[PDB]
Every structure is written in structure tokens, then in C-alpha cells.
Amino acid sequence: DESDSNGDINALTKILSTTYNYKDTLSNSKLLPPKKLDIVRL
Amino acid sequence: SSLSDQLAQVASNNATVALDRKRRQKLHSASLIYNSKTAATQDYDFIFENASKALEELSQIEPKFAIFSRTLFSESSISLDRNVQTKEEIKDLDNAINAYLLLASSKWYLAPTLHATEWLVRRFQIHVKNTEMLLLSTLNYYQTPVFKRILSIIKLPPLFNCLSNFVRSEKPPTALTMIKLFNDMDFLKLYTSYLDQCIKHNATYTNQLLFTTCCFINVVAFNSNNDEKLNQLVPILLEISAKLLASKSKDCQIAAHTILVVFATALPLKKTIILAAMETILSNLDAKEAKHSALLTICKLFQTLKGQGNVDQLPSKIFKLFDSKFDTVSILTFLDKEDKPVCDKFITSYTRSIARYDRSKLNIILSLLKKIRLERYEVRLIITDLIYLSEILEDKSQLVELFEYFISINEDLVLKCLKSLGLTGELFEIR
RNA sequence: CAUUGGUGAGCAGCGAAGGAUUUGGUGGAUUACUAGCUAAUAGCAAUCUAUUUCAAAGAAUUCAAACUUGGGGGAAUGCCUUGUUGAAUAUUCUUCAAGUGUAACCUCCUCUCAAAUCAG
């Protein structure tokens, strides 16, 4: 039965489905996220 | 395994099939109103007559409960016990019971509902035989002592395991137990399977739905640190939000709106996921009462993000969907509100999408840009695209008033980006 | 005063985006690893059923057969054994006695202790 062959209401679901990491870690946002420091002792 | 655990498993297989008569006076004697000494001595017919006596008033309140008189509350539907049926028949019994439960979930403050479902408890052991739907349909009533009675009767599944201390308790189950109940992950997969079931069946009423958002929202409140637990919490909430927006219902729309608001404000998603959120929000923004919430959702949504392309222009489908479901003068009214909430990161992104596809209403942009004190890079980034529409779009008096406003406010900012792009006297040679 | 006691505060000291504890569940080893099932040289493992059945092969203590019982008594009523009596057709069965006969069946033992308490 299940086949793929104005805005559609499947639009959130598909872009969820093509994502596993939903945090934008590919950003290099050049802002600092709060509460969590990526910090390494050297 | 041990023998004793392998045999106490057979208790779970036959917890309702009363074999000794003491098992009957255990299995029949628990019900939703009657005390167990008077609940022990109830004939089946006597309970079914009270069942119809509440069911007729319920069916007269709304006709959708009339069909359970044809099947569940039939006069022929007394003698049949569940365990005598095949599992393929038992599946249809459970289908009827479940569809009745989300139906009566609205009507549960009525003593008609309490007197109707008590027979179903007693005729079909739905405190034990199908207790996941019994609890999920009636989860929001945690303050009401009808539910508190129901807690002392339900064989508790592992999924509802916060209330293992609250069965046969005096004081009602607290609000924090609802969060700790919902703070599990697989419980949330059950609550999707409840709410998605209610969506296609269109049995979604307001009070339980407000309890849904208050629990899901408090889950992301509790997961403000556990960002990896949050990253496995996006699939359960954003699916409920998306499938929520496919409803005709407007309370469900503002429910999914609250979900998206608190989720983006607690965890920064990618920009494209927020574009998906915008498509699903605007693609079902039809009725009036959801528009005031849904505008503030995108106001929060574009503020929740930061990155490369932070205030970039929207796609042409997304922008035309937005300018179909809102006018220009909708946002021209909204920015002149005295609440005036901070949609700062949205306007400077949306004016560019006007400035590339439409370009027809930049007097509207002048009105827009005088309204809000924006961010520093934002005004500069608008002015660069307006330099682009100076160069490639044919120069017009609307843009002349735009840049005259931009010389009235932050002329030197224009001078700096003009030293970046183009020349100063060439911009006087524009118009 | 030793506290060599811990609480309790603390500090030096240790010290990389925690430390310390407690426990549930499951998996892995705890002998040195050649596959599962069946009717098994083979077939199965999606199946052995409308070849599984014919066939062959296949019957001694002429009835050896508690190696097994807490110990004494006895062992009435049973049984066993021969002695002995009748009947039927060389053998069972009726009848009867003798048995420091007897894992049936009756009783006695196989409980009362420098353990403790308690008067003197």
C-alpha cells in the first residue's frame, strides 16, 4: 500500500526523516552555545 | 528461568480467568464506584442495566456513543467473556474498547461516564485486559478521585511505573509524577500512539490536550542538560507536532505550536528543520484563532537559531505560503502592537525574500523597517541586498525613500558597506 | 594527655569537559571448540503424508527371579514349607496339622542431655 511513485503537511516529517543529528553541529555558528563548554585541558 | 517466575508468568496469562470461586470474588469485586463487599454481590444483568442507564444519557449527549449500544452495550453482550474468544476476536474487542476510551476521555467528569465504563471494567476486565488504553485515555484526570479510584484497580503495566506507589493511596498523584511518567522515552512512544490515534479518529478535546503539551513541554524542561537525551527526544515530539498539524482542529494546532516553541527555545535545531516547521505550520494555518499563536511561533522560531545564513531569505515556496496565509498588513499590524514581541531575526530575513521574488512592495518594507529597532549586522545585510536591487532591479522612488531613510538612520553604516561594495558617489549616481 | 574515636567544621594536598557508593537485569568465560532434527550409510531443515506398509528376523531357569527387612519378643488371623485328607482330570484345588516358620499382621525399645533454669 505505501508507495512514493500549496504547502504539504508531510513537510516536517520528511525533513526529520532525512536527519539523525538535529542539532546544527555542522554550523560553526560563531556564537557560543550556553551551559556547555567545549573545553579541553591542555 | 526459575520455575516460580515461569509460573507467576502464567498468573499474568490468566489474571482475569477466574477458576476458583475466590478468584471470582477477587475478579468481580473490584469496580469503579462500588465497595468490594457490595461489589462482590452484583449480578451481570444488574450492572448492565446501570450501564445502559448511563449510556443512554451519554448517547443523547453526543450520538457517537450510540454504536456501542449496538455492539458493546448490547443486551446480547453480557454473557460473553473475553477469554472464551479467539485472539482475532479479542483484537476487535480491544478495538471497540480503545475507540470507546478516547471517546469517553472527554466526557469523564460526568458520572454517566463513571457508571458506563465501570461495567466495561467489570464485563471486560479493562483495568487488566487492556490497561494501557485505559490509562492513556484517562491520564489527564490525575487530580480527580474517580481516576484515583481507577488507580487502585488497574493492574499496572511497566510503562506506567511511576504510580506503583500511588495505587491504593489517599492523596492524589502529584504533578511531578506526570513529568517523571513522561520523562521516559518509550512512554512518549506510547503517547504518540495515543495522540496519533486520536488525530485520525478526530477525538481530541482541549483539557487533555493542554495536559499533553504541559507534559511534553516539561519533558524538554527536564532535558535542558541531557542534550543527547534531547537528541533522541526530537523524533518523538516533532512527529507529534507534525501529525498534530494535520488536524482540522485549532486547539491541536496551537498545541503543536507550543511544542515547536518550547522545543526550539530549549534546543537549537538546524535551520532547515525550522523551515520544515514553517511549512507544516503555515500549510495548515486556516482558522482565525491559531494565527495569533502561530505568528509568535515563527517569531520565536527564527530567534532560536544562529549560524551561517542566520537571517537568510526564505525559499520561494515558503515565502509565498507565508504571504498567502498572512498579508503584508497582518505583520504591519502586528509589529505595531504594544506587546511588540521580539521577532527581530525574522523580519530581516523575510524582507530579503520580498526583495528577491516580489520586489513590488518596498514601501511596505519602509513601513516595516521604521517599526523595529533591528540588529546591527541585520540592517547592513538588508542594505547589501538593497544595493543589489539598486544595481540589477531598475531604480525606483521606493528604493530612493528606502536609502534616504538609511541615510537618516545609520548613514555611516551605508558608507561602510558601500566602501565594501561599490562606491559612494556611484550610489549618488544611482538616483 | 593518648585519643590511635568518629561526627563536625575546615585547610594544606590530590585532582583534564565530576567524584564516591549501592544495586537490578543480561551477556562472557568458569573442563579442550567437529554444526540442528529425524525413523539416520540416507532424507530433512517450506514436511514427512496419499510407499512407511508388505517382507523377513523376532518367545528357556520348562514358574531362576526382595541380592534391598531398625532390634527384641510373639506372630492369633494370613502366607510359606513339608507331614497329612478329599475331589476333578501325570497336575491344580477342597480339607488339616506340624513349623525357637515368617520384610503380612500385635506390643517394648530405637525420646528425658555434666544444655539451661530452679527451690536446698
Swiss-Prot record, chain A:
Q: What is the lineage of its organism?
A: Eukaryota, Fungi, Dikarya, Ascomycota, Saccharomycotina
This protein is called what?
A: U3 small nucleolar RNA-associated protein 18
Counting on the full-length protein, the chain here runs from: 180 to 238 of 594
Q: What else is known?
A: Present with 9570 molecules/cell in log phase SD medium.
Entry's localization field: Nucleus, Nucleolus
Quote the subunit structure annotation: Interacts with snoRNA U3. Interacts with MPP10, UTP21 and UTP25. Component of the ribosomal small subunit (SSU) processome composed of at least 40 protein subunits and snoRNA U3.
Question: Where does the record place the modification Phosphoserine?
Answer: 3, 5
Question: What is the superkingdom listed in this entry's lineage?
Answer: Eukaryota
The entry assigns this protein to a family as follows: Belongs to the WD repeat UTP18 family.
Q: What function does this protein fulfil?
A: Involved in nucleolar processing of pre-18S ribosomal RNA and ribosome assembly.
Transmembrane ranges, per UniProt, are none
Swiss-Prot record, chain B:
N-acetylserine: residues bearing it: 1
Q: Where in the cell is it found?
A: Nucleus, Nucleolus; Mitochondrion
Give the residues annotated as coiled coil.
none
Additional note from the record: Present with 18200 molecules/cell in log phase SD medium.
Subunit relationships: Interacts with snoRNA U3. Interacts with MPP10. Component of the ribosomal small subunit (SSU) processome composed of at least 40 protein subunits and snoRNA U3. In the absence of snoRNA3, forms a complex with other t-UTPs. This complex can associate with pre-18S ribosomal RNAs.
Function recorded in the entry: Involved in nucleolar processing of pre-18S ribosomal RNA. Required for optimal pre-ribosomal RNA transcription by RNA polymerase I together with a subset of U3 proteins required for transcription (t-UTPs). Involved in ribosome biosynthesis.
The record's family statement is: Belongs to the HEATR1/UTP10 family.
This one is known as U3 small nucleolar RNA-associated protein 10
Gene designation per UniProt: UTP10
